């Protein structure tokens, strides 16, 4: 068993199920970008490249009795293809822990799997918000063609509201007036929760009412920074070719390395559906 070295599979199906459940649960608690992004669904791991369509502006539809008014077609403005990266983190299982799970401690201890899944989720959010900048990916904060409003004085009671309202106004005049989501860095997010002298109402409540698709805190956003996004399909998308899963790497010094990995890409179809707070 454990003396045969490179066994192809060190785990039983229930231990794989526990490992993958742990990965799924920790990633669901940890991910921020998947709460604002729809998923272009599972393409399969053999699909390494996704179409990257970019739409410049919106053209209106038509109202006609007979349907002859000839509105323009939504197709793409620049068809690119972009390779889907692998986002991963490795963890190690000690082999006597697998043996002890088979004899004493019957659920397998998957704490390293949970920590690796949290770090893989952090890397996924890092690729969603900032790019890769070596592999030519654009994040939400780094998309060329995005809009930008100045980040005013957020220490004052009302600066965050003014910044978000101006951001949704600039998004609205580009034809993106949909459910907005706001992702803030933890500094600005905690600043919106402050109680000043005779506050009355928290600023985060007004922002949550204005951003119908939610106001979020992501620790991947650096400094005082944030982003407002018109959140739907046809604006941005998460092309997932393989969702988060554990893969066995083959034994090393009788221990069992695994990798939590996913293959996904952020597709920004409308860059002007993004307004960064800068």
């Amino acid at each position: 068993p454990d003396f045969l070295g490179h066994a192809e599979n060190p785990l039983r199906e229930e231990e794989w199920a526990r490992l993958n459940e742990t990965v799924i649960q920790v990633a669901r608690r940890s991910l921020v970008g998947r709460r604002i992004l729809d998923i272009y669904g599972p393409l399969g791991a053999g699909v390494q490249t996704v179409p990257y369509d970019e739409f410049q502006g919106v053209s209106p539809g038509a109202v006609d009795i007979v349907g002859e008014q000839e509105t323009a077609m939504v197709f793409t403005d620049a068809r690119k293809f972009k390779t889907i990266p692998i986002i991963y983190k490795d963890f190690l299982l000690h082999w006597r822990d697998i043996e002890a799970a088979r004899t004493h401690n019957m659920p397998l201890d998957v704490s390293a799997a949970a920590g690796a899944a949290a770090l893989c989720a952090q890397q996924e959010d890092e690729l969603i918000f900032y790019g890769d900048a070596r592999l030519g990916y654009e994040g939400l904060m780094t998309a060329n063609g995005r809009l930008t409003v100045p980040l005013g004085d957020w220490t004052s009671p009302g600066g965050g509201f003014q910044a978000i309202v101006e951001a949704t106004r600039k998004l609205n005049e580009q034809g993106h007036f949909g459910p907005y989501a706001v992702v803030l860095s933890p500094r600005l997010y905690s600043q919106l929760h402050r109680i000043y002298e005779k506050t009355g109402v928290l600023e985060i409540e007004t922002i949550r009412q204005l951003a119908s698709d939610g106001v979020y805190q992501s620790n991947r956003l650096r400094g005082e920074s944030g982003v407002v996004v018109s959140t739907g399909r046809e604006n941005m998308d998460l092309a997932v070719s393989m969702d988060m899963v554990a893969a066995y790497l083959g034994a090393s010094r009788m221990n069992h390395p695994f990798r939590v990995l996913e293959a996904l890409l952020l597709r920004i179809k409308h860059p002007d559906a993004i307004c960064t707070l800068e």
């Binding site: 993958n20 990965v23 799924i24 990633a27 669901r28 991910l31 998947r34 709460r35 604002i36 992004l37 729809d38 998923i39 669904g41 599972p42 393409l43 399969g44 959140t231 997932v240 070719s241 393989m242 969702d243 988060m244 899963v245 996913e262």
Partner: peptide, 9 residues
């Protein structure tokens, strides 16, 4: 696929 899935709803 879609093990984690969509967290949007």
């Amino acid at each position: 696929g879609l093990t984690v899935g969509s967290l949007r709803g």
